[PDB]
Amino acid sequence: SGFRKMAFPSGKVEGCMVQVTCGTTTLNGLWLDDVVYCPRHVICTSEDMLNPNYEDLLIRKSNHNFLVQAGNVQLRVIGHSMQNCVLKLKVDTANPKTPKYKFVRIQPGQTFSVLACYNGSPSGVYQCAMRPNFTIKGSFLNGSCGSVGFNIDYDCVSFCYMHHMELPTGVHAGTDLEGNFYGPFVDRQTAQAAGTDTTITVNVLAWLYAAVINGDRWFLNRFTTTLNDFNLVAMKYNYEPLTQDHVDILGPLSAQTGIAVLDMCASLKELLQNGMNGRTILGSALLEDEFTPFDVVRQCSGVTF
Amino acid sequence: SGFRKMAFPSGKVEGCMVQVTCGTTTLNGLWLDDVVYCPRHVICTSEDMLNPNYEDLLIRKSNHNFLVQAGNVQLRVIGHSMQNCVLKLKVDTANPKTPKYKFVRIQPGQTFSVLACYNGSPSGVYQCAMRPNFTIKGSFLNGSCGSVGFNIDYDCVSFCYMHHMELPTGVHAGTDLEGNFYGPFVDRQTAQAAGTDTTITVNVLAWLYAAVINGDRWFLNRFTTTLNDFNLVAMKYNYEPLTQDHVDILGPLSAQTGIAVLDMCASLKELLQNGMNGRTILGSALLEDEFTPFDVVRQCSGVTF
């Protein structure tokens, strides 16, 4: 037993990380088959980032201006193209460590593992959630751009995130692997509103189920509620509205624990209105929303890869 | 910026995980050079675990009774020996993926990454601390025995933990890679007191420094204290006594932030006596003690491997 915020094993992604240099700028790239993917602002100086014209800046670059290094291996760049906010560098060698992979665009509230990298070298791995406002609260220092987020299903890596920007508020923004930003953000050093974030309600409920499975039961109350009544409370506390789709996804956890979803909603309502009175749930003094229902089932069942 | 509980990249350890079967019992093993390391209770049935005589049980085992499988590879066992609580299975093939490695016995309060495995396959990775009472609060289901804990320094993996037991209280116990248990525990299914745990004071202080570096400053107070006065408070709240060695380890963080250690101790004293008044520090509603001072410096500096 026990419940931890667990990342996927990072080995399959470690073998894909390379370093990309253009001029004075160095960041991380992702080497899959004979293409290296990286943030297009590798072509920007610090001064370019205030108001970059990427088309004009890229025209001034040729294949030989992009230095791609995989450990000690220098990769030969034979083509370059810009797709949305990512650069695709065609190289003359297929990465022999390319795993089975997909590019996916995840939904807000879904979770993934980030392999934080600097200069093409992995520094650590952690699990996080895409916030409802399409930011992530990561750990990204200078040079971490190009680090990727991923999920693994058996032997297949689903890449869902590439890091591009730290907003002035300290939260993080990035793209899918086709270079389309999550949320309204752009790769320019300017003020950018993220807009109101909310708590991922279905994830909180999943984690309450994880707590019951592990023996933390004090929050179980004698009340029930309705979907519409619960959502009146959810709106007041800036929680995502719960839908029947969410109720359906919690089905297996409800069946394992014998606790109807709306009963768990009533316990969560009482937690929202009365606080936690200095108690903890699974070692946390606040309601945790970074576990999806699938995450809870995975961890409580021991799914491997 | 941002601060996350980050595990080491697990790739170098993934390549060492194998499955070990003896009779009906299957668990994880660690394959380094031509030796596979695993918990000796792989030779026990469920009934053996109530009161096992490992010497007598092992005598009834021969080399061909140990099935060692690395993915799809079947390893040939050519010798077996028991070292304390671990079995060493000599195999006829050196693991071609053996990293540079050390076996280390860590101190209480130090942190490491766990690669949770089942049937020899990695399921996830997470960072945890060795508690002062020599337990860990992990995520370990049936079959996770033999999963290992490690740190990485550049290209060298320092193995410090192998999982053996879930205590009746739900916390976890294990050995170093020489098979010596951390703490008073034994590999027998019986009641085992862990004894009073305490909070890792130097880690809490390191995390307060991490918070200041990332802009969370509300807890900074106008008081100072003394080492002896602070420890009077530490004893009352079941915190580890702070020593000058701990003050010395916090030196670099004190110098970066311009906050004297005893000033930070005074802020922590006020947090202990008055609580956090419904506020958070680095997104946490309790005082976090699973980051060492070295962990904070690593993450705030971007050290890679």
Swiss-Prot record, chains A, B:
Changing residue 132 to H: In strain: Omicron/BA.1, Omicron/BA.2, Omicron/BA.2.12.1, Omicron/BA.2.75, Omicron/BA.4, Omicron/BA.5, Omicron/BQ.1.1, Omicron/XBB.1.5, Omicron/EG.5.1. It catalyses: TSAVLQ-|-SGFRK-NH2 and SGVTFQ-|-GKFKK the two peptides corresponding to the two self-cleavage sites of the SARS 3C-like proteinase are the two most reactive peptide substrates. The enzyme exhibits a strong preference for substrates containing Gln at P1 position and Leu at P2 position. Inhibited by pyridone-containing alpha-ketoamides compounds 13a and 13b. In turn, alpha-ketoamide 13b (tert-butyl (1-((S)-1-(((S)-4-(benzylamino)-3,4-dioxo-1-((S)-2-oxopyrrolidin-3-yl)butan-2-yl)amino)-3-cyclopropyl-1-oxopropan-2-yl)-2-oxo-1,2-dihydropyridin-3-yl)carbamate) inhibits SARS-CoV-2 replication in human lung cells. Inhibited ex vivo by michael acceptor inhibitor N3. Inhibited ex vivo by compound 11a and 11b. Residues 1-305 form the Peptidase C30 domain. There is a cross-link at residues 5, 90 (Glycyl lysine isopeptide (Lys-Gly) (interchain with G-Cter in ubiquitin)). Changing residue 142 to A: Does not affect ability to cleave and inactivate human TRMT1. Residues 1-305 are cytoplasmic. The active site is at 41 (for 3cl-pro activity), 145 (nucleophile). It is found in: Host cytoplasm; Host Golgi apparatus; Host nucleus. Cleaves the C-terminus of replicase polyprotein at 11 sites. Recognizes substrates containing the core sequence [ILMVF]-Q-|-[SGACN]. Cleaves and inactivates human TRMT1, preventing tRNA guanine(26)-dimethylation of tRNAs. May cleave human NLRP1 in lung epithelial cells, thereby activating the NLRP1 inflammasome pathway. May cleave human GSDMD, triggering alternative GSDME-mediated epithelial cell death upon activation of the NLRP1 inflammasome, which may enhance the release interleukins 1B, 6, 16 and 18. Also able to bind an ADP-ribose-1''-phosphate (ADRP). 3CL-PRO exists as monomer and homodimer. Only the homodimer shows catalytic activity. Interacts with host FBXO22; this interaction promotes the proteasomal degradation of nsp5. This is 3C-like proteinase nsp5. The lineage of its organism: Viruses, Riboviria, Orthornavirae, Pisuviricota, Pisoniviricetes. The chain holds residues 3264 to 3568 of 7096 of the full protein.
